[PDB]
Design an enzyme around this catalytic site. Structure first.
Site, PDB file in Angstrom:
ATOM      1  N   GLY A  51      50.425 134.164  29.616  1.00  0.00           N
ATOM      2  CA  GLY A  51      50.980 135.492  29.740  1.00  0.00           C
ATOM      3  C   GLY A  51      50.785 136.159  31.083  1.00  0.00           C
ATOM      4  CB  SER A  80      50.541 130.485  31.391  1.00  0.00           C
ATOM      5  OG  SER A  80      50.869 131.503  32.321  1.00  0.00           O
ATOM      6  CG  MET A  81      47.540 134.305  33.227  1.00  0.00           C
ATOM      7  SD  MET A  81      46.757 133.969  34.827  1.00  0.00           S
ATOM      8  CE  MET A  81      45.030 134.277  34.464  1.00  0.00           C
ATOM      9  CG  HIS A 105      54.608 125.851  34.269  1.00  0.00           C
ATOM     10  ND1 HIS A 105      54.814 126.266  35.567  1.00  0.00           N
ATOM     11  CD2 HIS A 105      55.737 126.166  33.591  1.00  0.00           C
ATOM     12  CE1 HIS A 105      56.013 126.810  35.671  1.00  0.00           C
ATOM     13  NE2 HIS A 105      56.596 126.757  34.486  1.00  0.00           N
ATOM     14  CG  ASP A 143      58.294 123.449  33.571  1.00  0.00           C
ATOM     15  OD1 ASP A 143      58.009 124.482  32.928  1.00  0.00           O
ATOM     16  OD2 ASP A 143      59.271 123.373  34.341  1.00  0.00           O
TER      17      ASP A 143
END
Lengths: 163, 6, 160, 160, 161, 162, 159, 161, 6
Positions: A51, A80-81, A105, A143
């Site tokens: 996010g 992600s995060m 990614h 990705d």
């Protein structure tokens, strides 16, 4: 109720996407658990699609700041995060379950801060994982999914929980 | 996940 | 959830500042001062900013109460948030390493009055000419923890 | 928040005054007087104003109960908020330095003569003759803490 | 955040009176009478009025229960609220100094509310002490009163200053 | 809320009767009978009426449970509320002085409505003492009845005053 | 309300049977059997019926648990409801005097296989020939408490 | 709800499996193992299936905790619900007589592919069934009955009279 | 409102 029981055990559940509400939640819990016992561990379980980069950077800063060590554990997925928060866990206490997956990614606030935060994310990653910077630069731009094995080898976790 | 996470 | 945090004399300002958020923060400040007038309060700020009247009321309550209010920037302190950060207690104004602080700052005579007062207090608490505080709270900006410490907005960066 | 403020004998009036807010404040006042009919109450006002009947209900309750009701203007006391501020206990009517007070009060016959009944209370409490108050009420202009003090709406200005 | 008031045998009628408010007040009255049939109840009234059938349900309950129901007008008592005020226990009908009372008043059959209305008029007449004719006239007409005027009319006994 | 009146063995039927209200009332009746099969229940009725099937469920439950069910009309008992009122325990059917009672009566098979209609009118005949034709005629038309004409007709046993 | 009902080992099936109602009833049955595997359960049925899969899940959980499940039709037991009523414990299937019971019943191959198993179980419970069940559950019809007793859907009518 | 059920070390998986359902089941498993690491858990499955990553979280948790997790199919176990049924404890995988089980079964399609192959291989080891017949049976629209599912390796024993 | 209610 299960979340309350886990918190009595110094356990925080990050099981949703990271926006400012989840960020404030996790930050408040971190600060609270550190107020209750500054030198007792915290375990952060991560099952997050990722996010906001600002929200996640807030969580990360709080993890650094509090005296306790924050062990991180990937249950289902860290993207992600969420992957960044996993990789930013306590030295030696970064865990993943066997079939967990990790994609580092990473896709109103000024664009410049976003660039600069992205660069801090990149360098923090490089130091905690050992990869050359340029490599972290490439891999956080495409990705790409890893597993407990490939992640561990990359250095995003420290140990897989088997047997 | 204890032992040992915690 | 945050009720447990109130016990450790910690107030969480993680949302935008309107009249509701302000009455709550003011309520909690007054409460913590009633429970012990001479013990610290810690105000953690992760706020995009907001109403000038709401924030100024929180500023007034911070002054009035006898405790010292330490302010800590976690994620971002913008607009009134930033102001509330810069108006924490002497020596106890903090920011985490990757924090950011934009003092930029967006019901006509009153707004102008409050704005001039805000710029005066910013200029005294930072060590800046009022003519500069007017400038920087008018152009959209963004400052690092490092830029903010040398500007006079915070007193220390909490590292390790 | 308010649950724990209520234990320190503090009531928060931070929203506009309608019948729900009035019943809330009335009930809290009565409760606090039941728990101890000779210990103070502190009513913090940050209100845009509102219904004249609701406000009058609050006022009547303040009079009746044995405790003295200190009133404190945090952000803004307008309309019935300003009236409830001026109607606090003598000597214990307070405002914060950047607080602001406009006594401008916005069935036709009923509303008229009710307005007229308000002005006369305001007059006896402040001290201003009740022309001084009719002109001010028919006017859009607000007073600072110092102004409201000279005017009689306030007893003391809070800054230790 | 009203149960603590319920414990001191206080009921709060602070909204308009419809069937839900009626059922709530009726249940609270019956409950307070079950807990102690011979200890007072205090009904605080700040109500714009409302349904004549709902308010008559409340009134009936006030009569039936053994405890005496003192009524206190805080802010305003209009339409059925006013009626519920005037129907409080003998001697224990109070209003605050700036209270206001307008006995004015505006799914079920016509004849039903019609004689229901005639009935609440007769009750107002006995309680106030005014001729029926006079209660009859001053209900089909907008009018408002203060505690000083209400107590002259009969709707309250003593003012709490 | 009512959670406490239920402890005093009091059930509140203050809304129209549908399947949800019916299940609620039936559950409370069965509960109170489980807790004490031989202590009274009081059913306060302020109802506009409603579904004949839901109401008949409530009626059946009232019969089956060992306790006696005293019924009390507070505001209004219309349609199936009036039927539930008239069907309360012998001698313990009450109404307040200004109460009113209209026995007028207006996904499910149609033939079933006719048969339930029959048994409704029949039970009413038995309970009010009325000859059958009078119930049939009177549950076919709108008619208000004050507690006095209710007591006269036989829909209640006693009015409550003192 | 029913929290307290659950303590008297009573389960209320007063709505149409879909997967949520199923899961609810199943969880309550399993719970009551966990608390006492050899004390009775009373299932009161006032149901229009519904999904054959969700209704058959409740049926399986009724068999599996050690307690005897006495069934009681209050208002109406239709479709799966009826079935569940007929599938109650031997001797402890009840209805109230004005209760009514219509055994009518509305991948896809599974719903057909379940329909056949339902007919078989129903024929065993009633004693009537299957050949008739296979048609009866195909017809819009409704038996009374008495007619239901005669059929074999219940074996005792409550006073 | 179903907290009372938890006390008896029973978990209810009666909805589709997404990340919320996952986290729920995971937390409850961990909790039941904390309370008593060597007392059994019973996971009842009535699920249409769902996310492969969520289900895989649940599976990993089942493995890790010290207690034996018996799995019981009540109504239907499809997709990851079938996989979680087949992944219960040895000898304690059950189904009710009219249960049905179809092992038919944001994220990269390449990743979906590898995920599926790993899933297939687990089911193979778990049913004692050639992987090729496991991969072929997830292409079909077949649904195995309870008895059909028992002779395939998906459940250990069926419970009835 | 006591005294006197209640």
């Amino acid at each position: 109720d299960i979340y309350s029981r886990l918190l009595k055990d110094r356990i925080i559940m990050l099981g949703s996407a990271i926006d400012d509400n989840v960020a404030n939640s996790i930050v408040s819990q971190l600060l609270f658990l550190a107020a209750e016992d500054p030198e007792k561990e915290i375990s952060l379980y991560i099952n997050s699609p990722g996010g906001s980069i600002t929200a996640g950077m807030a969580i990360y800063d709080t993890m650094q700041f509090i005296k306790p060590k924050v062990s991180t554990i990937c249950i289902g997925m860290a993207a992600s995060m969420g992957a960044f928060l996993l990789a930013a866990g306590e030295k030696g206490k970064r865990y993943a379950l066997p079939n967990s997956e990790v994609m580092i990614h990473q896709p109103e606030i000024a664009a410049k801060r976003i660039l600069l935060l992205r660069d801090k994310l990149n360098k923090v990653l490089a130091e905690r994982t050992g990869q050359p910077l340029e490599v972290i630069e490439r891999d956080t731009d495409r990705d790409n999914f890893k597993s407990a094995e490939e992640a561990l080898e990359y250095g995003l976790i420290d140990k897989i929980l088997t047997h | 996940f204890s032992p040992x996470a915690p």
